[PDB]
Design a protein around this ligand. Structure first.
Ligand SMILES: *C(=O)N1C[C@H](NOS(=O)(=O)O)CC[C@H]1C(=O)NOCCN
Ligand SMILES: *C(=O)N1C[C@H](NOS(=O)(=O)O)CC[C@H]1C(=O)NOCCN
Ligand code: NA
Ligand code: NA
Lengths: 275, 275
């Protein structure tokens, strides 16, 4: 039962030197599980999911095709950050579609793409309000990637509870947020995600569909990695779905262990739900 | 004359809110120019040039082909840093040649590749000593990319004078450091560099050969960008060469202006040397 799975997870976490937030919500059925869920966890790149929702909603509502192109200035592509876009287009100063920018932002976690889209959409407070007005409490979106890169503590202003994340993912999945078209596009993009292959996906059978979004922080001079996260919707072998979110925060563990925590917890929920 | 070029550069720098270090050394002739050269500038990624020298020297001396492969563990490919390798190989755990790793490290500034190679070569102190024993004073190599990412001030321990950089580049170029084979390989790799196209190269004629290596820091909460650098060897239209190094340090300027400083100073030296 849910209780026993939960006790298994808590016992697993006993000897891990990190503050680990877990939530699971069945999509089609009533399954629900929360562990350490009343803390505020730094989202890092996970909030590119939320940004993508606000962007596509804005494109939908204002009737703007995702094939329309922004001019991406050289200066939008900062060297001082994770950015496959910048490596693909080192000169910048070119026209890129919303589609290409979103795909790089979500599937490849582009930091520049993220901030290009915050600017397009009208800033962090626009996304913060958008998510809020969907009826999901306990998500704070306050800082761009550039803002977070300036100072360690800024990441903690972009925070969430893990149960708000899976409430949001479930709303998304049951297409309560977007048009059909934009829904399919974001969903595909999340399945096509290439980052964190040994996180949620790490110990599930080969080929399991995991539509997800990672996030990761740096480590400070005290050995603390603020955030090692993965959030997503996973397809069970009978075609049903669950939303899951895991936040490994303020960890003294090494990165292999931080990812393993996510993979093992996910594997434990998977095993329980398949039966 | 050299003096007047120098006064032009100093006058240019007058209204730039940054501490800018410049050195130029003719390769074949006696041209020499230094501006603010007695300060210690944070190298950032420029020190991947120095690392590559130590690596190739170690491969040369120990008779190890650059086509031999390291096993790159998942954990060598940290998500929390600029890394085209990691995006190309998200699962990690594969065999990569020294050649592929060096190319990504130098030409595409891979941070993971850098630290993989520090470990191969035997650590920062091995590279520090190697450079020292070449007869080039005033270069300090103390910290890996992972070490620098933990704390703001760590970058200042990897420091250089700009005239040590061009002394080093000149030694390299006149093939006083490596075997023929490893020389050609590093030189090609530096020409194939794709980063910072609007730095040294930014205002020179199209097609000018610039064998170079960039580096860039983050910006802190006070608006200071610690480092915006480019170092290289440039081919004049009569086939002669000059080494140049520019360090735009502790700048309150925006990134466009920081790069422009490098491009305009380089353009001024180019124009003087072509005549
Ligand atoms: C996201 O969390 N990012 C961007 C990128 N992707 O990582 S991942 O989403 O976990 O795969 C690199 C890590 C992180 C950063 O934003 N890293 O920058 C350091 C934080 N100031
Ligand atoms: C090098 O300076 N790097 C690595 C990468 N390349 O930039 S570039 O060499 O200027 O083109 C990104 C910037 C920089 C970093 O190491 N960035 O990380 C932040 C410093 N802790
Ligand atoms: Na931060
Ligand atoms: Na640093």
């Amino acid at each position: 039962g849910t209780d026993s799975l939960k006790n298994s997870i808590e016992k697993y976490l006993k000897d891990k030197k990190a503050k680990v937030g877990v939530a699971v919500l069945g999509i089609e059925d009533n399954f629900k599980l929360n562990v350490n869920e009343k803390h505020h966890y730094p989202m890092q790149s996970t909030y590119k999911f939320h940004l993508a929702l606000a962007v596509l909603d804005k494109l939908d509502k204002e009737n703007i095709s995702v094939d329309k192109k922004l001019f991406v200035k050289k200066s939008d592509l900062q060297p001082n950050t994770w950015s496959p876009l910048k490596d693909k287009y080192p000169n910048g100063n070119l026209e890129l579609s919303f589609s290409e920018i979103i795909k790089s932002t979500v599937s490849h976690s582009d930091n520049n793409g993220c901030d290009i889209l915050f600017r397009f959409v009208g800033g962090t407070n626009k996304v913060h309000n958008f998510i809020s007005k969907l009826g999901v409490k306990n998500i704070s979106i306050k800082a761009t990637e550039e803002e977070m890169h300036k100072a360690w503590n800024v990441q903690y202003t972009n925070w969430t509870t893990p149960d708000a994340t899976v409430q949001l993912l479930k709303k998304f999945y049951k297409n309560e947020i977007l048009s059909k078209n934009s829904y399919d596009f974001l969903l595909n993009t999340m399945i096509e995600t290439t980052t964190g292959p040994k996180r949620l996906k790490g110990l599930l059978p080969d080929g399991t569909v995991v539509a997800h979004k990672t996030g990761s922080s740096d480590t400070n001079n005290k050995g603390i990695t603020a955030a090692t996260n993965d959030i997503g919707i996973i397809t069970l072998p009978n075609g049903k779905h669950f939303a899951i979110a895991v936040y490994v925060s303020d960890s003294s563990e090494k990165s292999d262990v931080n990812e393993k925590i996510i993979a093992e917890i996910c594997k434990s929920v998977w095993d329980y739900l398949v039966k």
